[PDB]
Amino acid sequence: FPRTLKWSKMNLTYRIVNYTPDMTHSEVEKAFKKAFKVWSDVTPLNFTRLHDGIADIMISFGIKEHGDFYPFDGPSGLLAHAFPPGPNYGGDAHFDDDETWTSSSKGYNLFLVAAHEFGHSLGLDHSKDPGALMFPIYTYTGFMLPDDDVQGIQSLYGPG
């Protein structure tokens, strides 16, 4: 307790509030869209992007103290966090812009980190399977959602 939790609805919205200097707008948008599709492809979840106003999953880049009780720490250490399902900060995902975000093998691959963090946004906890997306340690192995993660998200939301 309290490891997992699910949204009471499956039509979810998201908003990209701001953009990292590290990547182009298009690269950031592609990364987040692909990261949501990881989860919608195997469940009844569907994700719609909003360009303004409140969305369920608010996405932002920030440094140090950025508006919650979970400050970032400069280069290294923490790279991102996401709140469990619920109102207000619930579901929101924050990325530490004192890290280097990429669409490549350098730095942290934004797609891979976002896909993991959106798992947390949807109520998943970590896996003990080193091959799982939800494993606690970041690696870059070169995308198909591993079966451990498929089982985890389908146990909350059912299959697609």
Residues contacting residue 59 through CB under 8 Å, at least 6 positions apart:
14, 15, 16, 17, 32, 92, 93, 94, 95, 114
Q: Which two tokens stand for residue 131?
A: 């091959």
Residues 50-109 that bind ligand 8OM (CB under 6 A): 78-81
Per CB under 5 A, the list member of 27, 35, 97, 116 interacting with Ca ion is: 97
117 is annotated as an active-site residue: yes
> Residue 86 annotated as binding?
no
Cα(first)–Cα(last) distance of the chain, in Å?
27
What is the spatial distance between Cα 121 and Cα 92, in angstroms, rounded to a whole number? Answer: 7
27 binds Ca ion (CB under 5 A): no
The footprint of Zn ion on residues 22-81 (CB under 5 A) is 68, 70
Shortest separation between residue 130's beta carbon and ligand 8OM, angstroms: 9
Give the shortest CB-3-to-ligand 8OM separation in angstroms. Answer: 12
CB of 8: closest distance to Ca ion in angstroms? 13
**Total residues found in the chain within this entry:** 160
CA distance 60 to 29: 12
Instruction: Compose the 28-57 pattern: x for residues touching ligand 8OM by CB under 6 A, - for all others.
Output: ------------------------------
Please report the DSSP string for 68-137 in residue order.
SS----SSSS--EEEPPSSSTTTT-EEEETTSPEESSSSSEEHHHHHHHHHHHHTT----S-TTSTT-SS
Which residues participate in the annotated binding site for Zn(2+)? Answer: 66, 68, 81, 94, 116, 120, 126, 134
> What residues make contact with Zn ion under the rule CB under 5 A?
68, 70, 94
Chain residues that interact with ligand 8OM, rule: CB under 6 A: 78-81, 112-113, 116-117, 120, 133, 135-141, 146
Question: Which residues are identified as catalytic?
Answer: 117
